[PDB]
Design a protein around this ligand. Structure first.
Ligand SMILES: *P(=O)(O)OP(=O)(O)OP(=O)(O)OC[C@H]1O[C@@H](N2CN(C)c3c2nc(N)[nH]c3=O)[C@H](O)[C@@H]1O
Ligand SMILES: C[S@@+](CC[C@H](N)C(=O)[O-])C[C@H]1O[C@@H](n2cnc3c(N)ncnc32)[C@H](O)[C@@H]1O
Length: 405
RNA sequence: GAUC
């Protein structure tokens, strides 16, 4: 693979969206036969329903190169190969916060100043902005929003307890009156597992009780966990986390509200079916990878604007699917479809975009993967432009180049 | 995925 034939690094990013959905929202009746249960599948290599066989195989052999390469020795080449590496978290708690700084700019203040379809803001600067942040420890996403909105925003967060819990005291700004954590059933005493029906309903009730029963203006979800030793099966291993995050959106996001969620590879029809559901439920959806997302990984984001009225059937349906997933844990079964492949493919415009997205992200990732590998086999190579690139990105995004401590 |  020739990685040196990649486009020049740049602060400028382009975005294209899915076509706006014209078909009606699926109801309970229509979806009554949509859930397919079959053998649990831990193989990814043949998932070519929305991606060319060459591209899928190339990005997997490119990942698997590092199966025998030293992990630290690999991340040191990664640090050198990635032109956007030096940005890091600037004065925030992690680099994840700068992803929201990155994307809030690109999507025209969609999150810090949410509008409706007509161009009218949802919140009067001279009212209060409500947001939710799920699967979110230590809290970088909320750190950005709170730092940007001060006391004009109130955030509700749920994440897994443990070493990766929220770190309020480390927020550059914020306080307990700006950001209020809730861990599911039991409240502050829950575990924050978003994949539990109890926690789901509980956090939903909580968010509604504090948003005039309207829900939040937007939701951000950035869920992930270690897939060490079996990295290639990352999409499958986190299939449920993805579903629960899409579901949480349909559960607490107000009408006309927004939603941004981290996904990984989207080769399986299970994942693609989920996006299709978001596409039916929101006024406009796109798949985007910001430059603050490392170019060799399968990380991208799905950005959703304007929640449609009457999405409750889809909400109930997905809550129901999640329950089956909990029931099929440690068994040889699994939910492999949430929307029939014929229905997804029935929409040519959706499918055309979805395929084109998968492929353009594969080719970029392959090069970056090949790039890291080259930076392993040669430690003198480097991007001499990291400093100047970082500088323009902060200028562009309106992030002051000041320091944390 | 975050961190080291
Ligand atoms: P993130 O964990 O999804 O990815 P990250 O930004 O942290 O980059 P990194 O893990 O270091 O590597 C990028 C992609 O390659 C896969 N890896 C990592 N890794 C150590 C490893 C991978 N793949 C195989 N086949 N074998 C390996 O030992 C990551 O999951 C990313 O997709
Ligand atoms: C790396 S973080 C994202 C970073 C975060 N957005 C930030 O800016 O700090 C991913 C989080 O998802 C959480 N997570 C994974 N599985 C979860 C689950 N089933 N329920 C709740 N949180 C989960 C992890 O604990 C982890 O904290």
């Amino acid at each position: 693979v020739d990685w040196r034939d990649e486009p020049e690094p740049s602060a400028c990013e382009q975005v294209s969206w899915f076509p706006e959905c014209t078909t009606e929202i699926p109801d309970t009746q229509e979806m009554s036969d949509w859930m397919v249960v079959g053998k649990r599948k831990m193989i990814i290599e043949d998932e070519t329903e929305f991606c060319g066989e060459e591209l899928l195989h190339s990005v997997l052999q490119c990942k698997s190169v590092f199966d025998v390469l030293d992990g630290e020795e690999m991340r040191r080449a990664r640090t050198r190969a990635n032109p956007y590496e030096m940005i890091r978290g600037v004065f925030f708690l992690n680099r994840a916060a700068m992803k929201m700084a990155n994307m809030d700019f690109v999507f025209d203040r969609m999150f810090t100043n949410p509008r409706d379809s007509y161009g009218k803001p949802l919140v009067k600067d001279r009212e209060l902005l409500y947001f939710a942040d799920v699967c979110a420890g230590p809290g970088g996403f909320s750190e950005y929003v709170l730092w940007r909105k001060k006391w004009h925003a109130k955030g509700f967060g749920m994440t897994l307890k443990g070493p990766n819990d929220f770190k309020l005291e480390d927020f550059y700004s914020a306080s307990s009156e700006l950001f209020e954590p809730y861990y599911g059933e039991g409240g502050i005493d829950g575990d924050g597992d978003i994949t539990r029906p109890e926690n789901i309903s509980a956090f939903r009730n909580f968010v509604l009780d504090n948003t005039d029963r309207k829900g939040v203006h937007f939701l951000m979800a950035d869920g992930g966990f270690s897939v060490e030793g079996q990295e290639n099966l990352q999409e499958i291993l986190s299939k449920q986390l993805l579903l629960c995050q899409f579901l949480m959106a349909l559960s607490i996001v107000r009408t006309g509200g927004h939603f941004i969620c981290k996904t990984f590879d989207l080769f399986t029809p299970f994942s693609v079916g989920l996006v299709y559901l978001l596409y039916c439920c929101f006024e406009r959806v796109c798949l985007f990878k910001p430059i603050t997302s490392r170019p060799a990984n399968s990380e991208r984001y799905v950005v959703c604007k304007g929640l449609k009225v009457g999405i409750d059937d889809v909400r109930d349906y997905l809550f129901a699917v999640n329950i089956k997933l909990n029931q099929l844990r440690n068994t040889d079964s699994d939910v492999n479809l949430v929307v029939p492949l014929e229905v997804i493919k029935g929409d040519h415009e959706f499918t055309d975009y979805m395929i084109r997205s998968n492929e353009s992200h594969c080719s970029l990732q392959i090069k970056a993967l090949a790039k890291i590998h080259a930076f392993v086999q040669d430690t003198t190579l480097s991007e001499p432009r990291q400093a100047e690139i970082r500088k323009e990105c902060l200028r562009l995004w309106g992030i002051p180049d000041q320091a944390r401590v």
